[PDB]
């Protein structure tokens with residue numbers, strides 16, 4: 001089964017998921033010189049309710065915070081999107097060392113980690129699972145993390161990691177302030193792409209924020225002690241969980257800002 005180890009990692013995913021070499025795969029390199037500002041993008045609207053957060057779990061591939069999404073309390077609108085995309089989950093990608101770990105790379109710059117906020121088109125589709133199979137089904141906000149002063153807004157997450165050390169563990173997680181994990185500017189890049197994990201479906205409108213947030217080295221290290229293995233199984237550590245950028249293959253990246 002797929003992961004980020006030598007014999008199950010990204011270079012092998014095409015073996016079971018040949019859309020891995022598709023034309024709209026993510027993540028990507030953003031070459032700013034080539035990006036065009038687009039004045040037709042609407043203001044980005046983020047309404048998030050802390051009570052929408054329900055559980056945090058270790059999926060084996062990251063931690064996932066899952067939200068109650070039968071309600072429009074927490075939704076992403078505006079920007080490049082038509083309609084209301086309901087918040088579903090939040091997770092994080094990192095590498096085995098602090099100098100690289102983000103999935104998107106900007107003018108050859110990698111950050112230490114990248115948070116993803118996954119939303120789905122509940123104005124058109126019946127469920128997140130369904131919406132993952134349509135082109136306009138998903139919208140994912142990416143936020144880079146750079147090494148800097150520790151980030152107090154990550155404490156609710158970091159405090160839970162020992163409780164979810166093994167794959168499959170879950171813990172009650174509500175009253176989560178997601179909005180405060182976002183940087184003060186929301187200027188972004190946007191392009192059509194895919195999930196960055198199997199099944200790699202090409203159903204995502206990416207919205208990648210330019211401004212990073214901080215994380216300290218000590219805080220980032222706590223994520224690498226999560227296991228990709230379940231209880232009662234020989235331990236392996238989730239020290240890296242980022243897919244490398246894939247080629248643009250003709251797509252253009254748009255900017256929210258000039």
Ligand SMILES: NS(=O)(=O)c1c(F)c(F)c(S(=O)(=O)CCO)c(NC2CCCCCCC2)c1F
Pocket residue numbers: 059060061062063064089091092116118132140194195196197
């Ligand atoms: N990196 S990603 O944003 O493209 C993404 C999704 F968009 C996404 F929807 C998911 S999913 O997990 O919610 C199932 C999609 O059908 C994951 N998840 C992966 C990494 C984080 C751990 C939990 C999900 C299992 C793989 C995921 F990584």
